[PDB]
Write a protein that binds this DNA or RNA. Sequence first.
RNA 1: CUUUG
RNA 2: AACAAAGGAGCAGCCUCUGGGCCACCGUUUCGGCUUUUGUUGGUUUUAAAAGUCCAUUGGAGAUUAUGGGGCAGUGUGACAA
RNA 3: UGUUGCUGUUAAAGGGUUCGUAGUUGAAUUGAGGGCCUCUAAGGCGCAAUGGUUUAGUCCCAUCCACUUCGGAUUGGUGACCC
Lengths: 129, 82, 141, 200
Amino acid sequence: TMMSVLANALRCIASAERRGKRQVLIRPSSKVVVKFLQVMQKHGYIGEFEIIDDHRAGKIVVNLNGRLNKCGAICPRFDCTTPDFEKWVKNILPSRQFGFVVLTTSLGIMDHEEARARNTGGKVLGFFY
Amino acid sequence: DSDLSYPTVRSERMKHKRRRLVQGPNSYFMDVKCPGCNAITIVYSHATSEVQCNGCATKLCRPTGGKAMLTTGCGFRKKADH
Amino acid sequence: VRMQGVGHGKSASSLPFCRTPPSWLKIASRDVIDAVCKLAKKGLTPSRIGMQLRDSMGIAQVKNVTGRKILRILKHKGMAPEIPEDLYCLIKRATEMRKHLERNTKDRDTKFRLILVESRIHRLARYYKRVKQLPPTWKYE
Amino acid sequence: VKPHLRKLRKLKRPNPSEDEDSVAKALFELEATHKTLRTQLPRFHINTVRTLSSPRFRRTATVVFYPLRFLMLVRKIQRTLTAELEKRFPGSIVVLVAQRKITKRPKDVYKLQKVQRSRTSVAVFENILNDLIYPCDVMGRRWRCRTDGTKVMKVFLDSRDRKRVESRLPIIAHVYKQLTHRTVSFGFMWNPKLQQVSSR
RNA sequence: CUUUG
RNA sequence: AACAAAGGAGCAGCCUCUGGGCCACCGUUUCGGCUUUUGUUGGUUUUAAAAGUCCAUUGGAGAUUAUGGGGCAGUGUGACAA
RNA sequence: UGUUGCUGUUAAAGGGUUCGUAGUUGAAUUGAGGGCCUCUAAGGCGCAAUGGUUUAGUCCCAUCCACUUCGGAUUGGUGACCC
């Protein structure tokens, strides 16, 4: 059945950005999906988006640029600490330059740079290039 | 053309009722008058029973099909959805 | 996908976005609640009452006007069924099939089916003892 | 004592304000010889307090408050009463807003799940908006998130109601703002079933 | 009207 | 994120000021305990507080916290012999 | 030997089908505030006002050609637009 809501977003978005689409539909919705987009949207990976109401479960829409290459989730939601980060950055990202890893920390949902700066660890969530 | 947050008429009206961005109904109500009395009963377009005329009894519909079908000689106005 | 069979259905009902009741209705709360309980006295289950009430009175979703749902109404008046509709339905079905097999012993299809049914009974029952609504002394046969 | 300050709760009666009086009077005035059952209903009904909010617009925002238990008795008559008051007071719109009190998130798992859902922020705020644009209804909601992280909201009405409500809107927005401290915008549509949007 | 049956 | 609990009528619970009346409570497997003052100690009693309970009564709120509204005016009495 | 990190149509490998206990996994929701004071602060497709002389272009007037297929003029109107 439907297990992870999150990965049912980020898999869609990814694929569509290859296939040359300029917009995507994302059929379930969460309080997680929203936040994850808000992050990206700062930098310029995601251009805008809308949130449609149905009074049962929402739908979401996404705009696109061409500046995103891949995004995804790291499913079991492992744990990370203040030194630990460099493991994940050597692994999932292709470089220590332009990537980002996404985390859920004590403070809230953030991206690795921000995390290290404020000195929180936390669980992990997904990534985007 | 055809933004997915603001579609046309054509690109909605075709589709199955859960596959719109709205997920509305597909049905309406009506008013119906019998020859044998003066009354208005309020009846459901996909009724799926035989319904006895309000204050009379004779049946204003048959339950047949996926859309129910009025008994002959009974006049019917429609109603709003709003 | 189907619970213990196979099949994909999609036959369904989607009620409207607006949750406010129509303009044209000339009922109010009282009128509704009356008609509910009144028809319940015949021995209709919640399902049948709601269907009768859309086809005659034009009240679609009861919850919209009355401010509460069919089963709540009947519980408050003590007319709610002791063993809930959904499982009682199943039990009735199953018994009939068992009767048939007391005469038809070379039938095979029926018995494949009977398994599936009896299984389902259990699962429902166990969620009506997880959620308190049966005695813990409940048993099928 | 006054015969017309029994259309006001007990606790504002001894030493009332100015805008309070005008309203209270008007109800007591109406209460005789205005046909049937808006010459019984408003007896029961009382106001809690009042405010008068002043935008820079042509017209000003008269907002009432009355307590939540009279809600049922207001809805029926609501159309009528809104008319009658608009007559009296010139150059001001008029809106009737029921009075509600919210409970905040506790940050405890076990406390959270015992909260009465009706008085949570969402359902409150919804009802407030509905009370303003009473016959118009809400045919869709949406939220559009900008580059700047800044969420907006917008609400969609029915064209069938449009000519009536149309003028009022900027006022209504201003009112909703200074109550909730959230923003609202309004479109219309003309078919809600398939969902299109007015261009007219 | 300090009651009436 | 997990754990436990709920299964909604599994309730249909107003509050507060003041005055009056009555009233010992607490534990109890054959009456055991009792806070202060009257110089102090022992024995005895009266008085008050508080609690219980009823009645009268002040101001105020209500989103079942349920007045209010509606019914019988069956504990009954008094204000009309019109 | 594969937790990071394998393979299973034909190279070695999906068990004949189904029900089903322990075990593993499991949808959405209570929610993230505004006000005020400045800085070349990035934008308004919101609005008042002066400037357009083919010194922008386009509507609506004028006149003559014209059966497809004509263009001079009244800053026409700061309808509109730059700036």
